[PDB]
Write a protein that binds this ligand. Structure first.
Ligand SMILES: Nc1ncnc2c1ncn2[C@@H]1O[C@H](COP(=O)(O)OP(=O)(O)OP(=O)(O)O)[C@@H](O)[C@H]1O
Ligand SMILES: Nc1nc2c(ncn2[C@@H]2O[C@H](COP(=O)(O)OP(=O)(O)O)[C@@H](O)[C@H]2O)c(=O)[nH]1
Ligand SMILES: [Mg+2]
Ligand SMILES: [Mg+2]
Lengths: 51, 101, 352, 205, 66, 80
């Protein structure tokens, strides 16, 4: 639903701002989320829950 | 010296879940996309299913750190409702008071 | 009769008649206005046993332009706009009455929002498989078009051969009434009959046969959005409707021999907020570009003179029954609550 | 209540205040100097000084209101008053010059008289005696009679016997019926009176 | 411009209003820059705005921007 | 494209195309053969119409802008 100009201007902003550049579905975008944060088990509240 | 055997099992689950977190994260990444071949994702399914059961983070339970009560726990202080109230009602929890409005 | 005028010819109305109510004969209500009058104003005609329209500066301004129309130049688009209930529809009707009594051919669309919403039978078209027909909406209009223009539907004759089916066809030179009767009798051909009517009137007015008035109330419907859905529950666009595709052509100034007078309405519109009234806000970008260049005429609330004559017209019909309504203290409250808005005043007075 | 007992109800009456001082009595002069020292509650959103304010219709509107939907309740009220007025203008134009004099076209006069024709003078109370229930007739206070007239009218219009008829048409039709001492609500008044006559011998309980 | 006016405030439930009443005017009321009948399409809300001016017989005598 | 532009430009727009097509029909009705584009779009009346459409398109619409647009259209269409 974007013009060629808008589609290529959005793809250029993604390159500059370090976003995903290839067309990626929502399912595959979970890979980005998984590596953008620490896993729950690696959070200090989790492994240092108990004294 | 933990409160009970159930707290001791969760301590071990938290220790093993921490040790396998990176390995599980990497294998899961292979399963959580539509980019890689199914033949490769089917193998990753078997690999993460073969890891020790207590490496799975959903088996960790937030128990009261002083009484091991498995429910009625306030996450911010990691205490059961009973233990929290005991400290709060004696003025030992900074800034916490009874609420009237 | 301080609120009435004896001049019932809309061609002779002037600034001296501002604020005064002129009477539309029952014969002209049946012929000129089988449709188009506001529903509540229709209720007032049945209740008062008479139809009386205030003469206001919006219609007088517009009647001045139509009387000076140069029928050789391309048709001019006039757009009545204003806040909700300010009298846009009844200003259009005052202008339709003027042209109807000057022997103009009247193409009156009483509400174009009805062609983009709540369509039970949206059939696929046969003339063009990419468009949808609307037999009920089209046949309804054709009956009213026939009533208004029945004296001209025999003199006007088609200039082409139109094929309805394998067996049936309308040959060249047949009265235009035959095209109007095919659509009414056979609703499957109603949407195509409307398209042929708009096609021939636009063509034959530019030849000098007659003067044509195109009157579309709710014109902002044509270039907006619809609430009609396809069998796959996908939204339909107004251009894909045959009625809207063809009416959009009557709004172009590519013909001469008449005028195009339309009115904006937020009431009954789709995807427009309550307080939207200005041309671009209601027409959109596609709509403003389709009508530009056009002459926008503002319709506003009653001025002090118009307000008092409106109250007097209600008091002269005994419509205000509360014992305090005729008092000066009652009229000040009726002015504050309406804020001089004609529609709000009529609704407040309706139950007093 | 968030008002202390010290707060007095507001008196919304323009005439009460413009009344000259000379006309005032020594008692009425004291009441006016007293209120200047009293706390007054904020005027509710319901009532104003408007000349078109009618406390009876405002009360009927509240007894029709469902779930705090005053906008809808009031819309139904004004639609009923408009429907009554249009029905009378239709009866008026269709009548002869002689009958026209007797035809009422004011919906407020019809509404008030329609309710006054439904007010029950006397009512019954379910009394218990020896493990058995017997109703006892009793006079009705003015408040109760007016309330019952409005409750019977609203109840009748909400009856399921009416199929797909909108409330402004049902209520307008019942008001004009009661205005002419006819209808189900008028029958309910007559039945209550007739029952209160058959239990006159039970007035000593 | 030298036009006399007064300013005050009011609170009802969680609503807070600030009104500027001009000594002289024609009865115009603007609510957040909007005509009161466009801002308050409900007839009861407009009656509330009428109540203060009507009670003192000053309808059509002041301009308000609130 | 035009949809990508964030500032309206009157030149080479539907407005310029529509007004020019209208003025040509008017010249033809007068049986005048001065059909030069540069001359038709060089008058002062077109400059007011251009200034009015741009204001309607790039600024907030209001009753005063609609009135300025109205008076510009009436002069071009010879509506008095
Ligand atoms: N010229 C008039 N003569 C008599 N009554 C009028 C006139 N103009 C307005 N009214 C009253 O105001 C009501 C609303 O008028 P109308 O339907 O023309 O308004 P509108 O601006 O077209 O409305 P909308 O914004 O809903 O499209 C009418 O039903 C009538 O009671
Ligand atoms: N059934 C039928 N409809 C016709 C015929 N010719 C024209 N029409 C209708 O008249 C409308 C206007 O005609 P035209 O300008 O040819 O339409 P267009 O080709 O869609 O631009 C069409 O959209 C049709 O609905 C015909 O021969 N048969
Ligand atoms: Mg759990
Ligand atoms: Mg209208």
């Amino acid at each position: 639903s974007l013009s060629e100009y808008a589609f290529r201007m959005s793809r250029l902003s993604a390159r500059l701002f370090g976003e995903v550049t290839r067309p990626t579905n929502s399912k595959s975008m979970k890979v980005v989320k998984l590596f953008s944060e620490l896993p729950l088990a690696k959070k200090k509240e989790t492994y240092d829950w108990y004294p | 010296h933990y409160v009970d055997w159930r707290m001791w099992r969760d301590v071990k689950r938290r220790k093993m879940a921490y040790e396998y977190a990176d390995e599980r994260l990497r294998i899961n990444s292979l399963r959580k996309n539509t980019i890689l071949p199914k033949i490769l994702q089917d193998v990753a399914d078997e690999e993460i299913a073969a890891l020790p059961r207590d490496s799975c983070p959903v088996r960790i339970r937030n128990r009261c750190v002083m009484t091991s009560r498995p429910r009625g726990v306030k996450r911010r202080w990691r205490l059961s409702r009973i233990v929290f109230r005991h400290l709060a009602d004696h003025g030992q929890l900074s800034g916490i008071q009874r609420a009237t409005w | 009769a301080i609120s009435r005028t004896n001049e019932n010819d809309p061609a002779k109305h002037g600034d001296q008649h501002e604020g005064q109510h002129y009477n539309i004969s029952p014969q002209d209500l049946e012929t000129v206005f089988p449709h188009g009058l506001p529903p509540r104003f229709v209720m007032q005609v049945k209740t008062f046993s008479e139809a009386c329209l205030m003469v206001r500066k919006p219609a007088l301004e517009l009647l001045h332009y139509l009387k000076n129309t140069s029928f050789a130049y391309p048709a001019i688009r006039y757009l009545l706009y204003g806040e909700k209930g300010t009298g846009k529809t009844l200003s259009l009707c005052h202008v339709i009455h003027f042209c109807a009594k000057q022997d103009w051919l009247i193409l009156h669309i009483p509400d174009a929002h009805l062609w983009v919403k709540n369509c039970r039978d949206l059939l696929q078209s046969s003339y063009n498989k990419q468009r949808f027909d609307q037999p009920l909406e089209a046949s309804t209009w054709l009956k009213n078009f026939k009533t208004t223009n029945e004296r001209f539907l025999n003199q006007i004759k088609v200039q082409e051969k139109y094929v309805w089916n394998k067996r049936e066809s309308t040959e060249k030179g047949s009265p235009l009434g035959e095209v109007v009767e095919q659509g009414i009798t056979r609703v499957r051909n109603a949407t195509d009959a409307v398209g042929i009517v708009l096609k021939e009137l636009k063509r034959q007015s530019s030849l000098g046969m007659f003067h044509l008035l195109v009157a579309v109330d709710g014109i902002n419907a044509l270039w907006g959005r619809t609430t009609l859905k396809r069998e796959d529950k996908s939204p339909i666009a107004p251009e894909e409707l045959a009625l809207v595709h063809n009416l959009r052509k009557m709004m172009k100034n590519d013909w001469h021999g008449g005028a195009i007078v339309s009115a904006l309405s937020q009431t009954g519109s789709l995807f427009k907020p309550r307080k939207a009234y200005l041309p671009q806000e209601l027409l959109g970008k596609e709509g403003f570009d389709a009508l530009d260049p056009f002459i926008p005429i503002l319709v506003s609330n009653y001025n002090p003179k118009e307000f008092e004559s409106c109250i007097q017209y209600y008091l002269e019909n005994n419509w205000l029954q509360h014992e305090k309504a005729p008092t000066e203290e009652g009229k000040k409250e009726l002015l504050f609550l309406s804020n001089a808005n004609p529609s709000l005043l009529e609704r407040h007075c309706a139950y007093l | 209540s968030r008002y202390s007992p010290e707060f007095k109800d507001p008196l919304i009456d323009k005439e009460y205040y413009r009344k000259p001082v000379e006309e005032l009595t020594e008692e009425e002069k004291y009441v006016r100097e007293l209120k200047k020292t009293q706390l007054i509650k904020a005027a509710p959103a319901g009532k104003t000084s408007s000349v078109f304010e009618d406390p009876v219709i405002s009360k009927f509107t509240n007894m029709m209101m469902i779930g705090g939907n005053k906008v809808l309740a009031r819309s139904l009220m004004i639609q009923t008053l408009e429907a009554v007025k249009r029905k009378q203008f239709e009866k008026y134009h269709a009548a002869s010059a002689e009958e026209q004099a007797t035809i009422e076209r004011n919906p407020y006069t019809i509404f008030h008289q329609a309710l006054k024709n439904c007010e029950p003078m006397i009512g019954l109370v379910p009394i218990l005696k020896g493990g058995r229930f017997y109703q006892v007739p009793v006079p009705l206070p003015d408040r109760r009679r007016r309330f019952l007239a409005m409750k019977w009218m609203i109840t009748e219009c909400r009856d399921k016997k009416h199929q797909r008829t909108l409330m402004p048409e049902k209520l307008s039709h019942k008001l004009l019926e009661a205005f002419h001492n006819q209808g189900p609500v008028i029958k309910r008044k007559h039945d209550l009176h007739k029952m209160a006559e058959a239990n006159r011998a039970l007035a000593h309980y | 411009q030298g036009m006399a006016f007064s300013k005050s405030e009011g609170k009802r439930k969680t609503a807070k209003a600030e009104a500027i009443v001009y000594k002289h005017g024609s009865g115009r009321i603007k609510v957040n820059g909007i005509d009161y009948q466009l801002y308050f399409p409900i007839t009861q809300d407009r009656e509330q705005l009428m109540f203060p001016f009507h009670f003192v017989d000053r309808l059509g005598k002041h301009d308000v921007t609130c | 494209t035009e949809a990508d532009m964030e500032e309206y430009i009157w030149e080479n727009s539907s407005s310029e195309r529509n007004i020019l097509e209208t003025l040509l029909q008017m010249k033809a009705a007068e049986k005048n053969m001065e059909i030069n584009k540069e001359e038709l779009l060089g008058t002062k009346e077109i400059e007011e119409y251009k200034k009015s459409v741009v204001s309607l398109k790039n600024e907030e619409e209001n009753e005063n802008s609609i009135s300025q647009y109205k008076e510009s259209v009436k002069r071009l269409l010879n509506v008095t």
